[model samples]
Target: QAQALLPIASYAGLTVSAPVFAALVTVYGAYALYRYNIRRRENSYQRIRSDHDSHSCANNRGWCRPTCFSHEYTDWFNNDVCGSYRCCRPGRR
Candidate 1:
């Protein structure tokens, strides 16, 4: 992604260079933050479960099971701030 921006950055003249560079840095920084937020959210379930019990049922029910929430089922539980989705345990029946 940074390499893709080089052509545009190379075209900027001295008068606009500083602002262009700043804009690129700001854009990249925002992207990095967004990515970090996603990773943090995705791992939050594991973090919480690990704190309580190192063993998680997530592996038995598949990726979208006990750890991921489902928008398709509005009744499904969801984390208020983190937006983590969760489903039923593996052997509920």
Candidate 2:
């Protein structure tokens, strides 16, 4: 945050040059991506499980099952997020 702010202020003539700002932004972006990757891997199971558990059999509704959410999400994530079919494989029944 400080790095980014410094650059912004510099642009407004309150700090330094554009190169400095750009560098700060770039570094921040890389750090953010690293954090995102860490969080993503750590929470991946919960994310997958939450989607899988969205539909339950106890409510007595549709044909959706425990694996349905994960299957559907994996399909969507693979098709849309990944832009590939490789990750769309359905889990075991």
Candidate 3:
């Protein structure tokens, strides 16, 4: 008498080659770096804009008021500036 045994292993066709997997990982990594850089630059620009706004407020002899954006105030001001205008507290024009 002989006993029947099920096959131990099953063969499935290779789905992805090594090079393809490597390429996919590299692409994903590059994308991640790109996103990170974008975020960093955005934050830096925000800081620069905030500084510019605070400085602008000081020029007109007004106190810099905290808005939905920036909170810090700077003594420095310039006529040429970038980003949204800064909110200022009541003061002499």
Candidate 4:
């Protein structure tokens, strides 16, 4: 295509504010993203703590398992991303 003249000089004021507005939006977007991630992290932590009836399987000794959880093994807790389901071998089975 042939070169066409752009009205850059006519839009001088627009040039002054467009980039500023972009930066403003970027900061707000990052702040909102952080809040969302932190909220989920905190809630998931309490959820894992609650799953074991106020205990942490991530620290204590246990191996993650699947379904058919029986009386011999008690269910433990884990969090999101790559969840876990463990058993503590109740009564030292």
What does candidate 1's lDDT look like per residue over 1-93, in tens digits?
Answer: 122233332333322222223344556443543343322222212222111112323342322222322211121422221234343232222
Number of the top candidate by TM-score? 4
Greater lDDT among 2 and 4 belongs to 2
Q: Give TM-scores for every candidate, taking all chains together and pairing residue i with residue i.
A: 0.17, 0.16, 0.17, 0.20
- Candidate 3: pairs in clash: none
Report backbone clashes per prediction.
4, 0, 0, 0
Which residue segments of model 1 deviate by more than 4 Å? 1-51, 62-93
User: lDDT score, residue 80, model 4?
Assistant: 26
Query: In candidate 2, where is summed lDDT lowest over 10 consecutive residues?
Result: 38-47
User: How would you encode candidate 2's per-residue C-alpha lDDT over 13-88 as one tens digit per residue?
Assistant: 2232233333444654535433433222221111222122233221222223222323222333333333322232
Q: How many backbone clashes does candidate 2 have?
A: 0
Error of 3 at 53 (Å): 4.2
Instruction: Assess the local accuracy of residue 58 in candidate 2 as a C-alpha lDDT between 0 and 100.
Output: 19
Candidate 4 lDDT, 13-91, residue by residue in tens: 3321222223323543435433333221121111211122233343444433332112224444332211544443323
RMSD of 3: 24.1
Clashes in candidate 3: how many?
A: 0
Candidate 3: tens digits of C-alpha lDDT, residues 1-93: 001111111101222222222332355343543343322222111122122235434444433323322222232242223134444323212
